Amino acid sequence: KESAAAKFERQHMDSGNSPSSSSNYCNLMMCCRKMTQGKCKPVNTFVHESLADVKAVCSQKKVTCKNGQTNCYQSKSTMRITDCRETGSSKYPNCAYKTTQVEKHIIVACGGKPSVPVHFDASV
Amino acid sequence: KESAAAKFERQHMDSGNSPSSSSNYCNLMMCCRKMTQGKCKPVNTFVHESLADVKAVCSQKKVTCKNGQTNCYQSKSTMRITDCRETGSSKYPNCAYKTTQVEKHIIVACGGKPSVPVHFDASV
Ligand SMILES: Nc1ncnc2c1ncn2[C@@H]1O[C@H](COP(=O)(O)O[C@@H]2[C@H](O)[C@@H](CO)O[C@H]2n2ccc(=O)[nH]c2=O)[C@@H](O)[C@H]1O
Ligand SMILES: Nc1ncnc2c1ncn2[C@@H]1O[C@H](COP(=O)(O)O[C@@H]2[C@H](O)[C@@H](CO)O[C@H]2n2ccc(=O)[nH]c2=O)[C@@H](O)[C@H]1O
Numbered sequence: 742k743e744s745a746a747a748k749f750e751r752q753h754m755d756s757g758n759s760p761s762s763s764s765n766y767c768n769l770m771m772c773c774r775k776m777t778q779g780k781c782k783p784v785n786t787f788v789h790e791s792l793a794d795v796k797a798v799c800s801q802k803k804v805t806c807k808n809g810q811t812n813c814y815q816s817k818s819t820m821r822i823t824d825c826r827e828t829g830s831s832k833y834p835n836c837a838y839k840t841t842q843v844e845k846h847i848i849v850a851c852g853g854k855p856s857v858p859v860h861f862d863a864s865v
Numbered sequence: 866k867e868s869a870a871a872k873f874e875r876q877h878m879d880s881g882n883s884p885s886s887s888s889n890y891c892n893l894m895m896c897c898r899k900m901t902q903g904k905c906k907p908v909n910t911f912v913h914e915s916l917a918d919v920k921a922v923c924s925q926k927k928v929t930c931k932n933g934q935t936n937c938y939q940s941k942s943t944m945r946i947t948d949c950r951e952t953g954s955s956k957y958p959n960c961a962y963k964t965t966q967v968e969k970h971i972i973v974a975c976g977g978k979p980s981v982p983v984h985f986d987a988s989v
Contacts, residue, residue, distance in 0.1 A: 745976060745983040751898055753985050754919065755911045761887040761947070761964065773896035774875055787879040795878065823884065840885070852869060859869040861877050 767825035767838035781827050781836035786861050788847065789821040795858055799851035806862050812850045813862050819844045822864060891949035891962035905951055905960035910985050912971065913945040919982055923975035930986050936974045937986050943968045946988060 743751070767785075776782040788795055798816045806813040824841040831837040843864070850860035867875075883889075891909075900906040912919055922940045930937040948965045955961040967988070974984035 746981045749973075749982050749984065750916065752900060753910060753912055753982075754916060755894065755913060755947075756915050757913060760911070760913060761890040761966070763885045763887075766885040766893075769893035769897050770879065773893055776876060786877060787884070788877055789879055789881055789884055791880050792874070792878060823879070842885070849873075857870045858873045858877075860873065 764840050766823065767840040768836070771825055771836060771838055777834070777836040781831055781833050783827045785825045786847070786864065787823045787825065788861075789823070794818075794820070795847075795849070798847065798849055799856045799858060804848060806848075806850055810850065812852060813848050814851055815848045815865070816846045818846070820847050822847060824864070888964055890947060891964040892960070895949055895960065895962055901957075901960045903957075905955055905957045907951045909949045910971075910988060911947045911949065912985075913947070918944070919971075919973070922971065922973055923980045923982060928972060930972075930974055930984075934974060936976060937972050938975055939972045939989070940970045942970070944971050946971065948988070 770787060771777050771782065771785065776785055798814050800814070801817050802815040803811075804813050804815045805811055821844050822842075824843065825838045826841070828837045828839050845864040847864050848862040849858040850862055851857060852859045894911060895901050895906065895909060900909055922938050924938075925941050926939045927935075928937050928939045929935055945968055946966075948967065949962040950965070952961045952963055969988040971988050972986040973982040974986055975981060976983040
């Protein structure tokens with residue numbers, strides 16, 4: 742069982758000078774979206790365009806994936822994204838990330854029927 | 866078993882215009898701290914002072930809790946906190962919170978041995 746004390750720290754403590762700061766986006770999102778469980782995911786990109794714009798990439802420019810697979814597609818237009826990269830000081834389970842906001846073309850792998858994004862490959 | 870498609874949405878989609886806006890502190894925090902599972906927790910306060918400064922409240926002014934319990938203590942000093950209150954639009958699984966930052970005295974319930982904070986009761 743989680744102790745009542747640890748449970749209070751989880752639910753009410755966030756000690757620090759400016760916790761609502763932009764630079765904390767990846768830290769909280771990586772945590773919210775469950776990519777800090779069991780291990781820290783080193784690299785993850787979030788996309789801020791509509792789901793419909795991202796699903797459409799699966800119909801755009803076909804490119805080879807970094808890992809040599811051939812189901813990747815590059816976007817025609819540049820998208821608003823955020824890059825979450827694990828920092829130097831990061832150590833499970835104190836997962837820490839640098840937050841980088843950029844606008845770039847994305848490459849996704851697509852799969853299933855109907856074909857939708859199943860993997861973020863890179864940005865250019 | 867999570868589909869590859871739903872997984873992609875969970876891991877990379879954060880559609881919106883200002884995703885790292887301070888006003889999103891509560892939506893991210895409430896998700897990270899696991900208070901948006903099963904139901905949306907309606908009220909929840911985060912304290913930005915250090916843990917020792919909060920643990921110390923358990924040795925300050927003893928006061929009655931709002932539910933009639935007698936193990937509540939009120940900080941001697943005001944503290945930096947953030948109130949997260951569910952908005953009218955909020956409906957699980959689409960929980961949404963207003964973030965409000967104030968400086969107020971807190972009232973916690975303390976328990977165990979040593980006696981530490983186990984519940985957040987109110988701020989004044
Ligand atoms: N061609 C493919 N088809 C289907 N699934 C694939 C393919 N290539 C990789 N995958 C899988 O997709 C799964 C999900 O991974 P993702 O969330 O996309 O993770 C990305 C990538 O797999 C991982 C390792 O490099 O980092 C992320 N990543 C990488 C670079 C980047 O700029 N941004 C980003 O999010 C991984 O298990 C991987 O095995
Ligand atoms: N005196 C007490 N001793 C021990 N546990 C208690 C006591 N009073 C309530 N509890 C329990 O404390 C547990 C944890 O609750 P909390 O995380 O503090 O939640 C607070 C409160 O219980 C919940 C319901 O109102 O909202 C929060 N809350 C309320 C007001 C506020 O300003 N801020 C805030 O975080 C609850 O399960 C409750 O049963």
